[PDB]
Design a protein around this ligand. Structure first.
Ligand SMILES: CC(C)(COP(=O)(O)OP(=O)(O)OC[C@H]1O[C@@H](n2cnc3c(N)ncnc32)[C@H](O)[C@@H]1OP(=O)(O)O)[C@@H](O)C(=O)NCCC(=O)NCCS
Ligand SMILES: O=P(O)(O)O[C@H]1[C@@H](OP(=O)(O)O)[C@@H](OP(=O)(O)O)[C@@H](OP(=O)(O)O)[C@@H](OP(=O)(O)O)[C@H]1OP(=O)(O)O
Length: 320
C-alpha cells in the first residue's frame, strides 16, 4: 500500500460513486485494481472500451495533442491518406495475421505527414513470448508498406517500461500525451526518418529483444527496412515515469548521458522527484501466487494504475 496511489484513489472515489452507466462499473473496477484488490475482468478490454471518452478530454486538456483511436490498424492507413493535420498520434490494437481478429496489445503511433513518417512505440517488447508480437508488428509494417509508406521511414521503439500484460492501453495513452509534451525530439526523429535513418540505431537496436533475436538468428525476423531502437536512448525520461521495474529506474539513472537522471515531476513542486524516487513512491507488492513466489522484489511500481485513476477523474469531472 502506498500513500500516493491511495491519494489518487481518494481523489477518484467520489466521481465513480456519483457515476452512472458502464463508466461507473469501469471506475469501480479501476479503484479495486489500484487499491490492491482482485479484478474479476481483463483491463485491456475495459481500457479499450473506455479509451475514446478519455481521448476526448485529453484532446481538450492539451490542444494540439491530436490523439485518435482507430478500431483497426487499417483505419490508421485510411487516416494517413488524407490532407489532415501535419502531426497526429493514434492508438490501435494489432491484428492476428492468421485470423484477422484484433487481439488487444495496443500500440501508439506518432505520425508526421509530408511520404509520411510513422513512429510506433512499444510499451512492452517487440518479439514477445512466442514470437507473436513480432509477426503482428510484421503484419502492421507490411500493410503500412503496401499502403505506400516506405518501411525505411517507420520506426518501432521498444521501451520495456511496461512489465505487465494488462496495461497496454494506458501505457499507450501516457505515451501519446508524453509524445505531445516532447514534440521537439520527435520532430528530430522524424526529420531523420524522412531521409530513412534512425539515430544510434546501430547500438540501440541490440539492446531490444528484437536485437537479441536478430543476433541469435542471423536472418531477417522483422521486415527488411523498418527501424527499431531501445526507448532509453531515443526517448526522454517521461516515457519511463511509469516503469514498473525499480531495477530499470536504477539502471536508467546510472546512464552516462544522464538523460534519465533528472527530475521527473513538474518544477512547481516543493519536493523534487527523480525516476527512482517516483518508482519508490508508487512501490507496491504484486498479485500472483504463493506457490510460485518469484526472485527479485515481488514488488513493482503501480504508477500506471494511478495514471488510469487520473484519466478517469478527468473524464468524470469533465462530464458533470
Ligand atoms: C520483460 C519480460 C520478458 C521479462 O524480462 P525481466 O523483466 O528481465 O523478467 P524479470 O523476471 O527480471 O521481471 C523483473 C521485473 O518485472 C517486474 N514485474 C512487475 N510485475 C510484473 C508482471 N506482472 N510480470 C512480469 N514482470 C513484472 C518486477 O517488479 C521486476 O522489476 P524489479 O526487479 O524492479 O521489481 C517479462 O516481464 C514480460 O514483459 N513478458 C511479457 C512480454 C510478452 O510476451 N508480451 C507483452 C505484450 S502485452
Ligand atoms: O500523464 P500526463 O497527462 O502527462 O499528466 C501529468 C503527470 O502525470 P505522469 O505521472 O503520467 O507523468 C503528473 O502527475 P503524477 O502522477 O506524477 O502525480 C503531473 O503532476 P505533477 O508533476 O505536479 O506531480 C500533472 O498532473 P495534473 O493534471 O493533475 O496537474 C501532469 O499533467 P499537466 O500537464 O496538466 O500538468
Amino acid at each position: 500500500q502506498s500513500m500516493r496511489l491511495q491519494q489518487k484513489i481518494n481523489d477518484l472515489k467520489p466521481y465513480v460513486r456519483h457515476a452512472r452507466g458502464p463508466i461507473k462499473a469501469y471506475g469501480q473496477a479501476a479503484l479495486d485494481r489500484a487499491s490492491g484488490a482482485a479484478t474479476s475482468v481483463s483491463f485491456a478490454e475495459l481500457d479499450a472500451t473506455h479509451l475514446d471518452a478519455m481521448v476526448y478530454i485529453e484532446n481538450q486538456r492539451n490542444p494540439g495533442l491530436n490523439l485518435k483511436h482507430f478500431r483497426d490498424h487499417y483505419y490508421l492507413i485510411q487516416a494517413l491518406q488524407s490532407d489532415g493535420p501535419s502531426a497526429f498520434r493514434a492508438i490501435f490494437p494489432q491484428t492476428c495475421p492468421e485470423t484477422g481478429q484484433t487481439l488487444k496489445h495496443h500500440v501508439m503511433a506518432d505520425v508526421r505527414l509530408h511520404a509520411p513518417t510513422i513512429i510506433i512505440t512499444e510499451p512492452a517488447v517487440i518479439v514477445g513470448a512466442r514470437y507473436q508480437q513480432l509477426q503482428r508488428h510484421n503484419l502492421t509494417l507490411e500493410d503500412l508498406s503496401e499502403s505506400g509508406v516506405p518501411l525505411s521511414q517507420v520506426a518501432i521503439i521498444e521501451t520495456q517500461a511496461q512489465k505487465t500484460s494488462d496495461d497496454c492501453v494506458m501505457y499507450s495513452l501516457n505515451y501519446a500525451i508524453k509524445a505531445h509534451k516532447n514534440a521537439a525530439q520527435f520532430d528530430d526523429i522524424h526529420h531523420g526518418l524522412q531521409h530513412g535513418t534512425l539515430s544510434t540505431e546501430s547500438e540501440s537496436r541490440a539492446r531490444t529483444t528484437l536485437g537479441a533475436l536478430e543476433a541469435s538468428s542471423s536472418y531477417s525476423v522483422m521486415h527488411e527496412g523498418a527501424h527499431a531502437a531501445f526507448g532509453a536512448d531515443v526517448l526522454p525520461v517521461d516515457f519511463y515515469k511509469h516503469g514498473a521495474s525499480l531495477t530499470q529506474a536504477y539502471y536508467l539513472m546510472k546512464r552516462p548521458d544522464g538523460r534519465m537522471a533528472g527530475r521527473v515531476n513538474s518544477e512547481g513542486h516543493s519536493e523534487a522527484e527523480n525516476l527512482v524516487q517516483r518508482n519508490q513512491a508508487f512501490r507496491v507488492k504484486r498479485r500472483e501466487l504463493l506457490d510460485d513466489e518469484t526472485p527479485s522484489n515481488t514488488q513493482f511500481s503501480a504508477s500506471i494504475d494511478g495514471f488510469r485513476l487520473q484519466e478517469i477523474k478527468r473524464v468524470l469531472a469533465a462530464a458533470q
